[PDB]
Design a protein around this ligand. Sequence first.
Ligand SMILES: [Mg+2]
Ligand SMILES: [Zn+2]
Ligand SMILES: [Zn+2]
Ligand SMILES: [Zn+2]
Lengths: 258, 66, 446, 47, 49, 115, 59, 59, 28, 463, 32, 54, 50
Amino acid sequence: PYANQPTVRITELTDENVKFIIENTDLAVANSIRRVFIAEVPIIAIDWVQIDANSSVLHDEFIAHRLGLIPLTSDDIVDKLQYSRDCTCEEFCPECSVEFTLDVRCNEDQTRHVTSRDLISNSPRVIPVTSRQDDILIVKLRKGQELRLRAYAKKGFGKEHAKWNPTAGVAFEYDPDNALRHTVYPKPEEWPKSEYSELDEDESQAPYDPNGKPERFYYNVESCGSLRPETIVLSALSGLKKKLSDLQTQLSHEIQSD
Amino acid sequence: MIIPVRCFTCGKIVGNKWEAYLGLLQAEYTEGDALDALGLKRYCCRRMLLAHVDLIEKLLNYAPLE
Amino acid sequence: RHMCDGDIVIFNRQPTLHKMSMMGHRVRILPWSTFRLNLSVTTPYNADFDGDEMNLHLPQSLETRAEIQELAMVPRMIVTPQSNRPVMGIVQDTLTAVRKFTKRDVFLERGEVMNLLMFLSTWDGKVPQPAILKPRPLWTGKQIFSLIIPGHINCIRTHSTHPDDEDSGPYKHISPGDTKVVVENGELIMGILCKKSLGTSAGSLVHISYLEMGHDITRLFYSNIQTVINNWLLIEGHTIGIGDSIADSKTYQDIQNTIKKAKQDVIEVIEKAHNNELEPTPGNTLRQTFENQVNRILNDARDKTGSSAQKSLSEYNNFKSMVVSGAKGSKINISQVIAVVGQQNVEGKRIPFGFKHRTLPHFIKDDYGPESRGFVENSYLAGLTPTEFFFHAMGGREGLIDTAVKTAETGYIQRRLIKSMESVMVKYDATVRNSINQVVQLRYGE
Amino acid sequence: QQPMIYICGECHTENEIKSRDPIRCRECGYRIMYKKRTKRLVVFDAR
Amino acid sequence: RVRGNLMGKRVDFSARTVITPDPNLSIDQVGVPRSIAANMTFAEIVTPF
Amino acid sequence: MNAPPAFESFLLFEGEKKITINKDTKVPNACLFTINKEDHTLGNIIKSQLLKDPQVLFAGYKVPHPLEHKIIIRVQTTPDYSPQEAFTNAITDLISELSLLEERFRVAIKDKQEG
Amino acid sequence: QARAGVSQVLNRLTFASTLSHLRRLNSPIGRDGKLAKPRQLHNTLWGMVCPAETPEGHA
Amino acid sequence: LNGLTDRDLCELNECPLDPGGYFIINGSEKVLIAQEKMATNTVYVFAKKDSKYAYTGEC
Amino acid sequence: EITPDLWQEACWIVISSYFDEKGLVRQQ
Amino acid sequence: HIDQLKEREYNNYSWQDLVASGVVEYIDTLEEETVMLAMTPDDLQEKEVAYCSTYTHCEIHPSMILGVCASIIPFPDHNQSPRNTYQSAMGKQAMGVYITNFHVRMDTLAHVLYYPQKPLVTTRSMEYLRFRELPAGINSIVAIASYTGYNQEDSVIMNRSAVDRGFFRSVFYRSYKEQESKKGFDQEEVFEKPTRETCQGMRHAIYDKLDDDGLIAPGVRVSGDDVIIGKTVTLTKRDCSTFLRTSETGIVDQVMVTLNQEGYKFCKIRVRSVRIPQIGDKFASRHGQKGTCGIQYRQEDMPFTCEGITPDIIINPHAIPSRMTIGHLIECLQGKVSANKGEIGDATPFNDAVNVQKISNLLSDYGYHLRGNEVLYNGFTGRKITSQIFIGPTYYQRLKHMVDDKIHSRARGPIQILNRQPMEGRSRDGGLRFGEMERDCQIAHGAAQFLRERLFEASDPYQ
Amino acid sequence: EWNIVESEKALVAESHNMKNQQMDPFTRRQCK
Amino acid sequence: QTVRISQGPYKGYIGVVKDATESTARVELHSTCQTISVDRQRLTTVGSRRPGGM
Amino acid sequence: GSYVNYRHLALLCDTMTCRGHLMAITRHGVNRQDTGPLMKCSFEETVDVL
Ligand SMILES: [Mg+2]
Ligand SMILES: [Zn+2]
Ligand SMILES: [Zn+2]
Ligand SMILES: [Zn+2]
């Protein structure tokens, strides 16, 4: 009547994605961790843009939309900042936000490519993905136009909006061989073998297994560039733990109150 | 009108690849090869470079001044 | 005060053909801005959730609110007097989902069972004994569905794929194909549920529930059916694709052979008519009998191809599942998709000669062959020839024009019918009269 | 002291047009002219 | 007059909005939005209860 | 125009409780836990963890309406084991398992880098 | 006493609509006629008039 | 804009993609729908039955 | 010389030439 | 001729050359009845059973019969004629970049889409229709299935994360026209801020929002029942100025002022509005599969394939068999093939070399099921779905039938002048008509009190 | 230009591989 | 007048007060096309003037 | 293949055969009945009957 002892094994560690395997755990925990990877992951992003002069051809809101989707590295800043909603001051304080500025005006004859590199941030570590591969194209200006603005970044998670969605695409998969029969293939011979399939090329699918629980969940968390993959996993685990702790505290208070 | 910043389905940044895609297509590479040369595995992110129409150019033709 | 949750309104759709088009509903505010309503209530209104519009009036008097609540309400207006059968029935994906849910080969674990019971507004709170204790507790789809049936209902219905030569022979009370629905004490025992037992048909399970149990009980029955079947559909899942439209590569051979045989037969008929051998059938001229024979040959060929296609499907096919469930489709649709479309008639006849003695410039004069008069030999999966494409367009246009004229004529017909018997009623003297107190019937409906 | 500055149609040259005056550019002379962006706090939420 | 404003009139407290499916609601319920609910009203008599 | 904001899915409103206990009357030792501003993430793991415990006769959650941010968890244990302590133990052991999983993942990462 | 609808407002909602509107026909027969011979797609309309593009209301 | 290069069209706040062929009345795009009628100077021999004549040689 | 088989490509060059010489709204 | 024509543009070769050379010929409808037309040149002439062997002409390409809106339909022959006609009528209602110089136009009711991608499968006919340059839709990863139930009776489920990233996010403009004129000898209009003192007739709305010239400046927040132009007519003055229509809630793009033919001050203002795709918006594909978005789920809730590819739209499987739109399925399969390969595919109506078997064989060469089905996972619990869902790219459109432009309500609004009954029309803030058929239905229900209330109490009380 | 040459090479390749064409989903009319 | 929400979930938005009362005040949000009813104390005037005028 | 309860058919038949002669459902058969001027104008021929 207690929990289990899951094991972890990394198969590929890079600066763009990680492929780990989790064994000896329930399917619900795996799916929940996945949904946390996508939704509930603190990360910094643009959420308040003050446009002062936009003579471009696009709409006034289009600039804000594109700026909202520009990732910002927050390897060690997201854990320090606090949610603007829970701030105890007025105006976007640097202790709970990061300021940006963009002032580009096409003067020469050739057309400009206003890229993310023009976002001059006040903080050193909170910068768009241009450290170490072109930059995110914002808009194109022509001789006579300009784009002056300054925006602030805040902490948020994907559940609020897609801008705070660090993971590009999580490849969640378990039981490569259709052993638990959770999916019935009308013609097994017509399907290809999974990447993690240990079955030989002769047999189509593993035989049935009545007394068999799902284990060995494979993951392929792919970072967009803002947070490192392993960092995404650690943040998700810590956040899920915090949610459970808060729920437990609330439950204890409710029981005590009754 | 302009290349999006991220793939609608997946979420991977694709905004910073339109210029690279055009350059690779211009040099010698074809589309089917350039897409995987840039690093686009999933087919959901490959439509952004194949389906996208670049209409910002026609818009820039109507320069306000000079 | 503003409209709050629990208030009574009168939701209505613009074309009010019959009584079951303006029923009261209880209010429930939701964030987004779109009217919503249970899918079962879509059949009466004839709505389609494809950009429709539905009005919503609101009374301003406790008198009228109570009157609507007691007379015009959804649970109270389940059975209609026009055909004394239910109007709200399961006619969407829930129907196909439940059909697959009640097959003999449906087994659920404790987790799934306990998850499905949560979506039950009338659960007594006791877990039923599993149908298979060892080697592992496994419930069965029918056993879970029994708890959804309220009260002690008893009814007998037949499934869509019920072979007629089964009651006469042995295995009457134990059917190998799991047909012959049998419910006792409100518990499903045999058969697979389909439109024949859950849809809008006389004697359906919902009809029996309404007649025996109260209207609110039937309402809870509908709610539980949808809330459980839709949730289990997540684990099951339903779809459709090319894999469900491909034949077995032998059915194509049979279809091609049949089509070639039909072509040879029609050519032989034409040759006989040319050489003056086909004698006129009684009651018809030579051209009439020639056309009738050709049409019969083509229809027989189409039926043979459709039957061959139907017999060549697999239980996992989705078209067949949706057709046997009766949710949306028919056998002729599968026949047209796979085997062959058929003849593109217009004005109850074959394609006429718009040009001088020929349908289109491509075909030569006096070409009464099947493909030259509308017979579409190909199928929607394998594309269509341009000529048959144009003929198919002609048929669709004929149908559209028919629908437009019907939509314009039936309204006037209904208006005249309503303006001639708008004052007739049943007085307290248990007799039907009109505004002039002239007795029309000593007893309503004799 | 705001004389309601405008922007010419084709010249894109600023012009000071006051009430009870013809709508024409200071040079060349056209009949089309647009206004300038407001000076208010145009603040959007990149949502 | 007869068919225009005596047998078919225009009534207040009405609405007309697109419809969408919602199986989580019972057959007798209806998912009205918030704007229409706040715009309409229901005259209720005061009572100490 | 009536689209709800995005913070109403996780942030609590003034007056709304995060968790409320309500005893059921149809069977003994059965309570329905109603959670506010949560989704399947925080209910499916608890459902499974309760399923692991043998003393829990019944366990399962639901979502009264997808647009509404609320989930009801119904628990029924043996008469000698109240459902409150069952919920507490499920949360406690789940937290312990997540912490251990995090530690193992961290050590695996630190060993993977040059090792 | 004259005809109606001969000169319509060009629907500039999408380029396809503009192309369609600029190449559209209209028969002078009375609107919503009981007959059904002129509405039916005739065999001679091969390669001259699109057999699929047409309204679905009364016209 | 008779045979004018796309450069000028772009400079004149117009696009080379516009099909054209639509009048401008009071700043509104008016288009003339192509009306169809019976071909003139051709003999038609109909057979109207709802009349006193068996055949009618309209021209 | 006649163009056997290899005609799907030469089928649309004529269409391209026609649409280039005469526009879509050329009749008006 | 083909060689000389393929080198056109460069030298000077055009269609007139073919016509003069004596290769093509214009045959009109009256002469087409006396020629033995042929469909294709190779197939219908080689040597077989002697059909006619006297062909006089030969068509260019069979698919050329289609018109304008029908041509953009991929695989029209694979679908039933009514659905092709529905698509042809709905194509004209698709939003997008309707003209490149849209920022200069001041038309009324202009819609523009942010990211109008190009169809992954383009017919050889739309190359001249100019569709690829000005498309009207976005290629979405559509998965035909019944995930939850909110997409059952002709409805879809869009991805909230996709909308957040700008999926089918379009804009809505609304231009205005208003000018001063000499009404009479004493009557005269003039643009001027109607103050609270001199102007007698005046609205209970905000007026300092606009500048002194009387025209609201660009890029200013506006809402329903707000003054947009400062017109005041002297009788002291009457506020004869217009207001933004109720339930518009936009922002001013630009303000244009000029003189009309008469010589008076004429000005036009257009207000934009970022319409985020919400439930109730009508969508449609290129095959007649209309529908309205029922609910929107976030990415975490939507299902997913073996990798992170969540469907963007989920139509009802049941809409396929009754309507017989296999062309839609073929389009989805070919789009999957094209995306995997990396080049646009061909969907010409009659091609004799595009079947399902060959496409399936191509798709099998990339690690995907030959029929396009794939294994998803329940986005909630994470259990595999038993049925292999059919997911793949597909080109979808968005119609202008927004829900905000149709939603309407009423509570003792303005009344007419002739018969004291409510107004008519959403713009005039009118009530719905309680038609005679509704009266007959109510009589059938026998609810006389409700009937009398609707016809007297809430219609036109009078003593 | 690359698409034009691609189409021409596809046509010549299709003409070359004229060994056998046995496919199920395709048909054509054959009158008389 | 133009105000700015300094506390609460909408902290950071900018809008113009439409209808004000003794306790609450309706403020139309600039970005989103929706009007909310936020408490007056949560607002902070920012104004929009034009110094100079010469 | 549809079904309609016989009661409705019988009621329609009796109403069309109540006054002995076959009253037509059109304006020429119902307005001849001595129902009342306010009821005849509703169906058709408003000003004529008034
Ligand atoms: Mg409909
Ligand atoms: Zn702060
Ligand atoms: Zn993608
Ligand atoms: Zn000037």
